[PDB]
């Protein structure tokens with residue numbers, strides 16, 4: 001790229017509990033877990049920045065991380081697939 | 087990197103609502119009665135027909151068919 | 166006595182039967198499971214129905230009752 | 232003592248449903264977001280209010296809508312204190328928009344305001360074609376609108392000649408070259424121009440009412456799949472893969488999947 | 502073994518004296534199916550069919566133990582070809598196929614002139630394409646007084662539903678009226 | 683009347699005890715021909731492949747007067763076949 005902010009992410013399937021969606025616009029400030037790896041309920045797995053505001057998207061249940069569609073400093077828009085978990 | 091028009095003074099006729107000309111009714115050199123339909127114009131749920139103020143002869147027409155107009159634009163001039 | 170015909174199956178064979186049936190002027194219906202959102206046979210019948218957002222992907226064509 | 236007869240548990244459910252659906256229409260939401268008590272001064276119908284916001288907007292009076300309401304009140308007294316509802320409201324509607332467009336006021340007729348080209352509706356009103364108000368109009372303020380014709384006095388329908396439905400059937404059957412219903416017939420009479428355009432669009436695009444609203448207003452996203460229920464167990468599954476750059480002919484290629492089949496459609500970029 | 506029929510599909514506008522029309526083929530679906538050989542000529546998506554050649558688009562052939570079954574296959578292979586951007590003889594061939602006189606197999610060369618009801622053709626239907634166009638136009642140039650933007654995100658609407666039957670058991674003010682005016 | 687041959691094209695990788703390779707089909711060329719019957723199943727353009735059905739992409743069948751002619755119909759229509767992005771039992 002020169003800058004992977006160009007990349008298009010698929011949309012989270014909304015009626016599917018494995019897909020975490022972007023609840024709002026913003027930026028990936030820190031990638032935190034990798035593809036295929038164990039996490040507990042309420043674990044930080046991705047720090048976003050909204051409008052000079054932190055918020056740390058956390059895991060809904062105990063999981064094996066299926067996919068991660070993001071790197072540090074990627075653009076994100078409402079309804080974007082950020083993570084999958086089993 | 088469209089001439090407006092003269093309110094106060096001369097017998098021009100200005101655009102009195104902004105929209106589209108749906109039909110020009112009278113040609114550039116022609117006689118015309120007072121209150122005669124001249125020009126037909128369309129806004130959203132609106133339609134002003136334009137009419138003869140005097141009772142005279144038309145010098146010019148500054149719109150065709152399907153033309154967009156703004157408020158205070160010249161469309162006819164009559165003496 | 167057959168005006169309308171359903172195929173309890175997928176893939177090549179559903180297609181084949183749909184064509185037989187169409188050729189006898191018999192109206193057709195296909196079933197698909199969830200994994201089969203996009204098997205072609207879904208699109209080759211006159212009508213089509215999702216079998217079960219309850220049932221397993223293997224299981225969805227074995228549900229006698231549904 | 233008296234209660235309301237209905238199902239609440241169920242109306243909450245209806246409510247959650249329209250809460251979301253309304254979302255689809257936010258482009259058409261009015262500027263009111265508060266109860267306004269100056270309503271007792273305007274008297275503008277609730278079901279004109281947002282239809283006229285739209286209208287004002289389109290003639291470049293968006294933002295200037297508050298002055299469009301001032302005039303709506305002023306127009307009312309101009310006319311002798313009338314009832315305002317469809318279509319008498321529309322005439323007030325138009326005379327307010329019209330006067331505001333033209334920095335006009337009540338004195339711009341009373342010995343002053345002449346050759347003005349009033350809207351359709353408003354000349355209609357003084358011609359009498361909407362009716363006769365309780366208290367009438369003010370001759371001197373009408374004269375200058377219609378001069379040429381005069382007021383017709385009787386309710387219109389008792390002199391308006393009857394419409395010929397025979398001739399209307401031959402007309403629609405001729406242009407549509409097919410079978411044509413009684414609905415078509417009054418729909419056409421009620422709305423000659425608009426009905427025609429509905430037909431234009433229908434020949435061109437089929438029955439749009441089956442599209443979901445979001446797709447209807449916005450189309451599709453690259454990689455999006457859309458289901459259109461066409462009947463019981465009949466649907467179109469449509470996938471938009473990508474769109475290409477406009478070829479030198481101003482035409483883009485859209486790569487589609489429809490019902491398990493690859494399809495390409497060409498559209499002109501305006 | 503059994504019987505076989507062949508039809509040739511041509512650019513020929515059967516309503517315009519059978520004149521070979523030309524242009525770009527902007528879409529093309531063949532059928533397939535047992536007992537059906539497709540022999541593709543000019544017929545396929547992308548072709549520039551040319552004023553200067555034989556207009557055969559496809560040669561279609563079917564085969565079954567009975568004439569009637571061969572006919573049933575021809576009718577269906579035809580019914581299932583869609584070609585757009587040019588008028589075709591398909592509606593005709595279908596009509597040839599359903600004709601009592603063709604099937605009985607007692608027919609002569611005068612068959613076509615002696616049967617006016619083979620040109621009993623209706624201008625074709627196309628709901629599916631027409632929709633792709635609408636979406637195509639709105640995606641690119643957008644809708645009248647709607648803010649030309651990405652298809653905004655929407656919350657997943659959960660739509661409550663009651664069965665027709667329960668509905669049909671209900672007796673409301675509508676039944677009231679039908680009852681007592 | 684003559685001879686007919688069938689075989690099945692499976693996602694089974696012969697170079698792996700026949701293990702039904704799974705994933706997406708990103709290229710598909712069905713041939714056909716005279717005396718060829720193609721009964722398509724899991725084999726088409728976009729949509730991908732489930733582990734949870736018996737691996738059947740195309741059932742491929744051929745017909746001619748002698749066995750020889752049928753077999754050489756079959757090889758040709760295998761050779762003309764190009765599926766991609768999953769492995770196949772074709773060679």
Ligand SMILES: O=CCCCC[C@@H]1SC[C@@H]2NC(=O)N[C@@H]21
Pocket residue numbers: 131276278279280282283316317318319320321322324
């Ligand atoms: O064409 C746009 C919708 C119609 C605008 C006028 C409506 S009709 C009912 C209500 N009463 C009015 O006088 N205006 C609105």
